[PDB]
Design a binder for this molecule. Structure first.
Ligand SMILES: O=C(O)CCC(=O)C(=O)O
Ligand code: NI
Length: 245
């Protein structure tokens, strides 16, 4: 089918109030079919002579990293001039109350392989950013596959975007590319956001989120679009001693 969902006031209101929103169908099934073909070429599962398969990308070729590609639009420029991109930009504009022309953006691709046992630990995306420069922004996480709690859908801490940027630390201080995590989220307050293919979740830069392991025999592919304002100078920057400069 070629139908796609809409957004209304209620979506925006809940995004502002809770720090995230679910969009059941941000990409049509035909757009999803094309996005899957883009991925099928971006993420090649490759065999070895008698050992384990690996994904033929940077990061995969210590402990395994989540297969990801920053700015996949460099390799597939067809990506960022899709109707799905424009639709997402318009959504970002509505949710951020900023003109589409004011938004800077980039893409990010993720693949959780079958039986991938590592979670994406609790974190806030702003924890990765320079505390000297504040941007308003959000991420639109579009899934190409069914996303369930068992396959690695996102979980959020509702209202956490109006709290502080929580203390983070590197998962491993001698292996910083593994990323950041915080221990300061009460998992009992969390809410999961399962999605059907072509669904998306949207979250503020400051909303804490987590993704479970992929316990299923199927890969779970997400395509993330990040939209943000220009940076503003912060007079009294937070220390963020976990920053990798
Ligand atoms: O897909 C995941 O496992 C995590 C996604 C995430 O952290 C994000 O989109 O900001
Ligand atoms: Ni994140």
């Amino acid at each position: 089918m070629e139908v796609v969902g809409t957004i209304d006031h209620r979506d925006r209101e809940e995004f502002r109030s809770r720090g995230f929103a679910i969009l059941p169908q941000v990409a049509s099934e035909s757009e999803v079919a094309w996005l899957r073909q883009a991925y099928d070429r971006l993420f090649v599962r490759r065999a070895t002579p008698g050992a384990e398969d690996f994904y033929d990308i940077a990061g995969q070729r210590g402990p395994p990293l989540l297969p990801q590609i920053i700015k996949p639009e460099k390799y597939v420029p067809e990506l960022l001039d899709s109707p799905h991109f424009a639709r997402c930009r318009s959504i970002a504009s509505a949710f951020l109350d900023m003109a589409e022309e004011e938004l800077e953006f980039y893409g990010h691709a993720i693949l959780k392989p079958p039986r991938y046992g590592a979670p994406t630990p609790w974190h806030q995306d702003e924890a990765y950013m320079d505390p000297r420069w504040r941007r308003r922004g959000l991420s639109i996480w579009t899934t190409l596959d069914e996303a369930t709690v068992e396959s690695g859908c996102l979980h959020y801490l509702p209202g956490g975007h109006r709290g502080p940027v929580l203390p983070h630390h590197h998962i491993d201080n001698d292996d910083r590319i593994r990323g950041l995590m915080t221990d300061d989220v009460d998992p009992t307050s969390a809410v999961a956001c399962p999605l059907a293919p072509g669904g998306a979740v949207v979250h503020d830069f400051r909303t804490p989120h987590y993704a479970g392991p992929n316990l299923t025999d199927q890969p779970r592919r997400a395509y993330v679009l990040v939209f943000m304002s220009a940076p503003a100078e912060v007079a009294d920057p937070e220390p963020r001693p976990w920053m990798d400069w």
